[PDB]
Design an enzyme around this catalytic site. Structure first.
Site, PDB file in Angstrom:
ATOM      1  N   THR B   1       1.125  -1.673   0.215  1.00 40.56           N
ATOM      2  CA  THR B   1       0.031   0.313  -0.059  1.00 40.56           C
ATOM      3  C   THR B   1       1.151   1.207  -0.049  1.00 40.56           C
ATOM      4  O   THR B   1       2.316   1.549   0.325  1.00 40.56           O
ATOM      5  CB  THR B   1      -0.954   0.049   1.017  1.00 40.56           C
ATOM      6  OG1 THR B   1      -2.386  -0.490   1.431  1.00 40.56           O
ATOM      7  CG2 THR B   1      -1.862   1.919   1.787  1.00 40.56           C
ATOM      8  N   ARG B  29     -10.529 -10.379  -4.872  1.00 43.23           N
ATOM      9  CA  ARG B  29     -10.467  -9.498  -3.164  1.00 43.23           C
ATOM     10  C   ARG B  29     -10.268  -8.445  -3.243  1.00 43.23           C
ATOM     11  O   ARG B  29      -8.859  -8.090  -4.148  1.00 43.23           O
ATOM     12  CB  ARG B  29      -9.740 -10.442  -2.088  1.00 43.23           C
ATOM     13  CG  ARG B  29      -9.705 -10.437  -0.595  1.00 43.23           C
ATOM     14  CD  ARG B  29      -8.202  -9.051  -0.498  1.00 43.23           C
ATOM     15  NE  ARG B  29      -8.388  -8.389   0.695  1.00 43.23           N
ATOM     16  CZ  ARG B  29      -7.572  -7.473   0.635  1.00 43.23           C
ATOM     17  NH1 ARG B  29      -7.058  -7.043  -0.651  1.00 43.23           N
ATOM     18  NH2 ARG B  29      -7.095  -7.005   2.035  1.00 43.23           N
ATOM     19  N   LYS B  53      -3.989  -4.432   7.290  1.00 48.63           N
ATOM     20  CA  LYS B  53      -4.890  -5.394   6.790  1.00 48.63           C
ATOM     21  C   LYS B  53      -5.977  -5.014   6.360  1.00 48.63           C
ATOM     22  O   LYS B  53      -7.095  -4.564   7.679  1.00 48.63           O
ATOM     23  CB  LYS B  53      -4.884  -6.803   8.576  1.00 48.63           C
ATOM     24  CG  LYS B  53      -4.689  -8.133   8.098  1.00 48.63           C
ATOM     25  CD  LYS B  53      -5.560  -8.727   7.485  1.00 48.63           C
ATOM     26  CE  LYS B  53      -7.486  -8.705   7.719  1.00 48.63           C
ATOM     27  NZ  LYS B  53      -7.890  -9.588   9.144  1.00 48.63           N
TER      28      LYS B  53
HETATM   29 CL   LIG Z   1      -5.008  -5.026   2.067  1.00 47.98          CL
END
Ligand SMILES: [Cl-]
Ligand SMILES: [Cl-]
Ligand SMILES: [Cl-]
Ligand code: NA
Ligand code: NA
Lengths: 166, 133, 133, 158
Positions: B1, B29, B53
């Site tokens: 990220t 996902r 997460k």
């Molecule tokens: Cl993620």
């Protein structure tokens, strides 16, 4: 007097013993991209333009899990997602399921400004990219050895892991 | 990220977040990064970009809670950022960066480390990985 | 879109929303309905399911906001749901349904109508389309 | 203390010019599902179970935009999405880009329950559906002729 900026390259479980090979390029990445953000704000580019500019650069750091250097799915493939938001207008743009788009953040922008929608995903979002003419690359170009090796270890442990995992 | 947040002299705020997601995610996902109010949010009052997460960021709608705690309960950027991170997310799952209309910068995280930088027009800079401790 | 929100006598809340989206939407276009915080949200305090112009609901994170207003500013379910629908969202774009932990039902909308129905153990039930009058 | 339930089958511009043949099956649709959810709460099924069950039925009503009777893309295709959330646990589930799946909300529950993720989409959501053995039909069966004409009209209207 005026502007502030912040940026990141991921949060996770990063050991204090991160090796030089793993640590220096990420530290360098942070600097390179921060210099660019600061210069753009110094030149008074609109903050929305600045965040897209800095994230394109973060995406281009092979050692950060976005764009080139994206972590891998269970199938060993690439699926990138991105979002952007203008706080002044509430406008926003998002994308998911990119496999060849070199700079996802810039497609999120394009969706924001050039589409009555906010969020596009998977085949439809690659269709949009093609239509808009953004840079696309062979999927392989996004993949790093480091990432292949992480998948392997995650795949035998049967876990879903953050790029930064012990 | 990856992510970046910025504000100018006038309060104009903005936020961007990009990711490959999680290692070994199932195909198809979706994480927090593409969701507004989860991973990315920007406002009159602040801009936020979250990381970690994914699912745990969706669950707590991180980027939006921050803005929401500020406007609705009057928390400063700092307090709101710390509150979402250190009190409403399991440890070791989430960091975020944020800036406010007025120039404030908050970079809390409950992971072991978060690759991050920041700067202000007045002259402050910082690169960092682990907590100052 | 379709949705249902439910709560038992012990204040265990839930939300579920489902749609085909927007007529003539570009292929691949995602709306509010699958975004936790926008189209669907459920808490300790309340549960919410929205519907209408997906893009306006994403942007106004309406399911989270109703909850956030309640918790952070102390508003009732009716006040909070009304603020989001009749203040922070454009006319003709959005309707929602909600229940509270205590059994309260709110169903504001700023569209011409909203196909809706509700009931309580205590005996109340309406079904409706246009605003009550 | 007592249970409560609310449900909807869509918000938007619903005309005073609304014919009975389109009004009544939506009113019957709403009534049928209210009773299904109420009977579930009376029997004290968990709220989460109850909202899936009611949303499942609201889907099965061809007159609402979800499941069978879903609206169409610019390509005349069905792309369905759902989400489900338990407020006592904060557990979440979502799907997007479904085309052959009869009850998308039930697939959103399965991601919640059987997967470490909250959200799956498009081909991968459809894979998961297949592993799970949920009811798939093929996509003709989801397309009402109300929605085909709806789409044509919206295209020339733009
Ligand atoms: Cl993620
Ligand atoms: Cl450090
Ligand atoms: Cl929609
Ligand atoms: Na990268
Ligand atoms: Na239906």
């Amino acid at each position: 007097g005026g502007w502030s900026i912040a940026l990141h390259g991921g949060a996770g479980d990063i050991p204090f013993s991160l090796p030089p090979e793993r640590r220096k390029p990420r530290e360098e990445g942070l600097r390179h991209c921060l210099q660019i953000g600061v210069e753009a704000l110094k030149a008074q580019k609109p903050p929305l333009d600045v965040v897209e500019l800095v994230v394109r650069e973060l995406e281009n750091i092979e050692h950060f899990n976005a764009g080139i250097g994206s972590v891998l799915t269970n199938s060993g493939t690439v699926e990138m997602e991105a979002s952007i938001m203008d706080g002044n207008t509430m406008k926003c743009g998002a994308v998911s399921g990119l496999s060849t788009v070199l700079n996802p953040i810039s497609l999120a922008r394009l969706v924001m400004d050039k589409t009555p929608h906010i969020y596009l995903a998977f085949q439809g979002a690659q269709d949009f990219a093609k239509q808009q003419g953004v840079e696309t690359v062979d999927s392989s170009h996004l993949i790093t050895a480091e990432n292949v090796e992480r998948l392997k270890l995650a795949i035998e442990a049967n876990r879903v892991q953050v790029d930064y995992s012990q | 990220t990856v992510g970046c947040v910025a504000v100018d002299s006038h309060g104009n705020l903005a936020s961007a977040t990009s990711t490959g997601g999680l290692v070994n995610k199932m195909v198809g996902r979706i994480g927090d990064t593409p969701l507004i109010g989860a991973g990315t949010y920007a406002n009159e009052l602040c801009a936020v970009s979250a990381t970690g997460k994914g699912e745990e960021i969706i669950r707590a709608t991180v980027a939006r809670d921050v803005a929401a705690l500020m406007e609705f309960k009057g928390l400063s950027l700092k307090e709101a950022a710390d509150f979402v991170i250190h009190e409403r997310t399991p440890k070791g799952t989430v960091g975020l960066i944020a800036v406010s209309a007025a120039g404030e910068i908050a970079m809390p995280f409950n992971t072991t480390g978060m690759f991050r930088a920041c700067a202000t027009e007045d002259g402050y800079s910082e690169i960092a990985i682990w907590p100052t401790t």
